[PDB]
Ligand binder design. Structure first.
Ligand SMILES: Cc1cc2nc3c(=O)[nH]c(=O)nc-3n(C[C@H](O)[C@H](O)[C@H](O)COP(=O)(O)OP(=O)(O)OC[C@H]3O[C@@H](n4cnc5c(N)ncnc54)[C@H](O)[C@@H]3O)c2cc1C
Ligand SMILES: [Xe]
Ligand SMILES: [Xe]
Length: 455
């Protein structure tokens, strides 16, 4: 409708992307290549008022609203067929202060712009481990990475935000301003509106001692048992994750391990590197290590490596849950399952959290499952679309195969088929509180391309 559209055009100064344009096919592609959808309109916003006009417009037109930060939605939420995509990719600007250890990021930041900005002052705050992830979706659902055991979730360092709500108002939210929303936005998702600015606290982070190695799959049981019990008792400073995968063809690996299923191990000591050297060495021989790399890295460097691969995978499928305890039978399963991995980029990942995260009260934020120390992520990944059924199937026979030991799911790991699963991840009780807040700030469920919260 022209009256509605012309008003939008006048107030908006960000590039427009229409269904026809030469850049349409690229603008609508997201990282998750299995989602192939065609929106009515793509708005690459370049400022806060840009976003406001776009929020109202979609509402007055009855356009379904998709919000996209870095496009990594494993569930494919940041693109739609037949509606509007609010792309904040252009809002990528960042303010720092050495003298205030504070940063202000627009809602479309990629991690690597952010980490770059803070490490300019030898500063950092926890975020994910792969740098081109969008800051937006990551934080909205919670957000962890290397510093999380020491310093908590990204949301655990979040102070204020600027957010555009469905009714087109602009609000600041913090612990003292609309704390109901600030509570809800720390973990609920984009259900409540579009974050245009984020406020954090910053910590000083110098060179960190880091190690990755490749243990033979024969030694899988003892390493994980060692891994799980030791991490039960590991310093907050120690972070140690496991990636089970086909062995990369690296010259550091013996040819007889190339292309064979191995266990990788990535670890680091957030702290003095001298203490680190001692501590990592003590756990590196949980089994016989191969393709051993040790370095002292600026934290920026810790984020960049994730992850070495010569091909970027087009098609992905993920299945994730939490565990309170990993039994021996659980250990045998995953180990049992691994041998079946048949594509070079799919990983069954095993992360151990707790630390600063578990010392935070379960109801203190919208992030549920703090008390669950374990995360497992079954990440099918491949290229050839026709092969979809073979890999896609594997991860389920896995969550499904391993689906008891589990209690929940991380919202930022839901795949495109898990929209109904929104209730077990958050748990019941929390969700009732969330629905009250959504009903106050988004009574109409305008924002439904997320792990959706009905009003
Ligand atoms: C390869 C990979 C690695 C990852 N590693 C980690 C990790 O180490 N730690 C971790 O915690 N998570 C991790 N994640 C999860 C990550 O949070 C999700 O991929 C998430 O979808 C990425 O956010 P995004 O804004 O880039 O994606 P989007 O799809 O654009 O965002 C996902 C959801 O958030 C909404 N949203 C996004 N930005 C905004 C905004 N500014 N305002 C309002 N709503 C918004 C979207 O509409 C959608 O509802 C990883 C994901 C991938 C794919
Ligand atoms: Xe700031
Ligand atoms: Xe992944």
């Amino acid at each position: 409708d022209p009256a509605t559209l012309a008003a939008f055009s006048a107030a908006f100064r960000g590039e427009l992307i229409w269904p026809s344009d030469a850049d349409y096919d690229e603008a609508r592609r997201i990282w998750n290549g299995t989602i192939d959808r065609r929106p009515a309109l793509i708005a690459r916003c370049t400022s806060t008022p840009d976003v406001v006009a776009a929020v109202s417009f979609a509402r007055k037109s009855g356009l379904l609203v998709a919000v996209r930060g870095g496009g990594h939605s494993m569930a494919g939420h940041s693109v739609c067929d037949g509606g509007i995509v609010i792309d904040l990719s252009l809002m990528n600007s960042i303010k720092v202060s050495r003298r205030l250890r504070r940063a202000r990021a627009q809602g479309g930041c990629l991690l690597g712009a952010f980490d770059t900005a803070t490490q300019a002052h030898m500063l950092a705050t926890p975020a994910g481990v792969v740098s081109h992830t969008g800051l937006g979706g990551l934080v909205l659902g919670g957000g962890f990475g290397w510093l999380s055991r020491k310093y908590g979730l990204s949301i655990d360092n979040l102070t204020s935000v600027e957010i555009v709500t469905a009714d087109g108002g602009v609000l600041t939210a913090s612990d003292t301003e609309n704390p109901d929303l600030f509570w809800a936005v720390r973990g609920g998702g984009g259900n409540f509106g579009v974050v245009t600015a984020f406020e954090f606290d910053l910590h000083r982070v110098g060179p960190v001692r880091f190690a990755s190695t490749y243990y033979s799959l024969d030694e899988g049981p003892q390493v994980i048992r060692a891994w799980r019990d030791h991490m039960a008792t590991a310093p907050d400073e120690l972070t140690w994750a496991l990636y089970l995968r086909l062995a990369p063809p690296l010259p550091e690996l013996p040819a007889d391990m190339h292309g064979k299923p191995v266990i990788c191990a990535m670890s680091c000591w957030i702290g003095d590197p001298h203490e680190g050297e001692r501590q990592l060495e003590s756990i590196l021989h949980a089994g016989k290590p191969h393709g051993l790399t040790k370095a002292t890295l600026p934290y920026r460097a810790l984020q960049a490596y994730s992850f070495p691969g010569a091909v970027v995978p087009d098609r992905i499928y993920t299945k994730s849950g939490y565990l309170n305890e990993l039994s021996d039978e659980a250990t045998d399963t995953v180990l049992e399952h691994a041998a079946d991995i048949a594509s070079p980029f799919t990983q069954l990942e095993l992360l151990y959290l707790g630390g600063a995260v578990a010392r935070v009260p379960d109801d203190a934020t919208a992030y549920p499952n703090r008390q669950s120390p374990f995360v497992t992520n079954l990440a099918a990944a491949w290229m050839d679309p026709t092969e979809d059924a073979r890999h896609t199937a594997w991860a389920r026979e896995g969550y499904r195969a391993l689906a008891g030991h589990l209690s929940g799911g991380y919202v930022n790991f839901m795949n495109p088929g898990e929209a109904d699963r929104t209730r077990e991840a958050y748990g019941a009780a929390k969700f009732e509180r969330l629905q009250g807040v959504k009903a106050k700030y988004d009574p109409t469920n305008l924002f439904r391309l997320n792990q959706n919260i009905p009003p």
